[PDB]
Amino acid sequence: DIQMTQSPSSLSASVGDRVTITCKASQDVSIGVAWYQRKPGKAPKLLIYSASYRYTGVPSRFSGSGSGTDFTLTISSLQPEDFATYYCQQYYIYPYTFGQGTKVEIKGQPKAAPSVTLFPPSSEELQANKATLVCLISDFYPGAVTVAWKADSSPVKAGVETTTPSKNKYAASSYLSLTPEQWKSHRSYSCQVTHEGSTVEKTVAPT
Amino acid sequence: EVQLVESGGGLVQPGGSLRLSCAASGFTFTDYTMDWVRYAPGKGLEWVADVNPNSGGSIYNQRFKGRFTLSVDRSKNTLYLQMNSLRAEDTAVYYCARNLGPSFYFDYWGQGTLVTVSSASTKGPSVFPLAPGTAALGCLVKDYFPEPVTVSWNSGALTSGVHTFPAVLQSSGLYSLSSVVTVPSSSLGTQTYICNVNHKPSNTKVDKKVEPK
Helix, strand or coil: CCCEEEECCEEEECCCCCEEEEEEECCCCCCCEEEEEECCCCCCEEEEECCCEECCCCCCCEEEEEECCEEEEEECCCCHHHCEEEEEEECCCCCCCECCCEEEEECCCCCCCCEEEEECCCHHHHHCCCCEEEEEEEECCCCCEEEEEEECCEEEEEEEECCEECCCCEEEEEEEECCHHHHHHCCCEEEEEEECCEEEEEEECCC | CCEEEEECCEEECCCCCEEEEEEEECCCHHHCCEEEEEEECCCEEEEEEEEECCCCEEEECCCCCCCEEEEEEHHHCEEEEEECCCCHHHCEEEEEEEECCCCCCEEEECCCEEEEECCCCCECCEEEEECCCEEEEEEEEEEEECCCCEEEEHHHCECCCEEECCCEECCCCCEEEEEEEEEEHHHCCCCCCEEEEEEHHHCEEEEEECCCC
């Protein structure tokens, strides 16, 4: 029943920064609060317990504070291996609820154009009476991008897509399925990728 | 020293049942309460249940009471989660975890296991070559279910310059992914490039040689 609200939901930051994450409990949970670091595809990792005690082996740049309903995790100087999602958790009372997480993302290059790579259908897929256009996207920043597809210069479809960090840059991709007659009969097809004030469009043609 | 090794994930249809195992080592198994905690993209973390192996008692989160059951096998130092009446919304990565003592925050965790609940059928992937200073070539791994697939190049010998993109769910309920390797243009005549696609959920591996256009 006890709600745990973190804020911000996400933030961008650079090596050396001071990061401060906030967790608010919907009621008094005393000193009974833990913080965890979670990397993608990895187990959460315990950092802080009792609101302010560093767990064994946890670097000193991590520290927590708070009591009652207002809690804080603070990273004194953000290190490279610290981009991750940080969760607060109350263990004061059942059911030991977690905060929704706060993504701490590499700032990167916020005004860079998206890098876009576009592959046409292979002769193999065309022979299987099918065909797929493959648009690959690599960005130096965390934000969502918009992808629009074009047949010649007419729009086909268009969606917003979130990117995810990679094993560094953020990645996404989009797919457009076509009949073989669709691919052969148009002069070209295009994937167009937009982030804020930058757009990159790549074009392919049956050749 | 302290290890929790899980097994048992997989695909199951709505209403089905599945049992997960947590094999423990490096501590007196019965001296600690243990837990399950699940994670789902965009749903964060949810504590599921705990068992005190000393009292034999377990406690469940409201959403799972009456349908999930904990149990333990001391002789094997192993914790189980039995899930019944699963719904699509139970799709998640399940972790076993341990309390330090009486307080319910978690010091050690399992590696995690994916449980997918869906009425959609397992389908192995269609693998298509993406024909290519340097050249980018790839494979398209198309129309598969459920996750995950893994892609390697040249049997895992080639790791530099490889980029596997996250799987994308189409509105057909099937996934597609691509993996691209960037190699010297001068390599293209003399060096063979083979993508190795492993889809454990359908017990299928597919290897595709990528040729110039």
